[PDB]
């Protein structure tokens, strides 16, 4: 039925047992669950074969980023601007990152930096003109 298949749904219930409140959205090629897991915001890409292709939770802060991560961040240029999302983005098969988004002093830009788990920054964009910048277009 409507919003996600029954085999999709089935899936995110197989991977979280306790998953509820789930709202499904769609996200070019994929569905994507969004619900709470243990009081943080998860979202959990799923292809049409209902195989998971990228789980982002929502840590909200750097407080919950490896030291390395936030050693690499306050040393970098980036580290003048206001953190504004940080999000630990993993996938099936390829190495975790860690996604940091930050507005600057004047207001309008914003910046998006991903770090692999111990700090070394891998790509970093403006995407102050980026409408969905977790979206799958950034990492699949």
């Known amino acids: 039925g409507d919003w996600a298949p029954a085999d999709v749904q089935a899936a995110l219930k197989k991977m979280y ?49 490896p030291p390395a991560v936030y050693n690499a961040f306050a040393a970098s240029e980036y580290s003048g601007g206001m953190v504004q999302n940080v999000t630990w983005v993993q996938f099936p098969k390829w190495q975790s990152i860690v996604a940091v988004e930050v507005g600057m002093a004047n207001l309008q830009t914003k910046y998006q930096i991903l770090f692999t788990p111990t700090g070394e920054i891998i790509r970093a964009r403006n995407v102050t003109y980026t409408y969905n910048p977790l979206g799958a277009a950034t990492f699949l």
């Not at 509820?20 to 979202?43: C, I, P, Q, R």
């Open 17 to 65: 047992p306790t998953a509820d409140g789930v709202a499904w959205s769609h996200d070019e090629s994929y569905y994507v669950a969004d619900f709470l897991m243990n009081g943080f915001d998860t979202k959990v890409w799923f292809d049409g074969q209902a195989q998971w292709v990228m789980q982002q939770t929502d840590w909200e802060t750097m407080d919950e980023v």
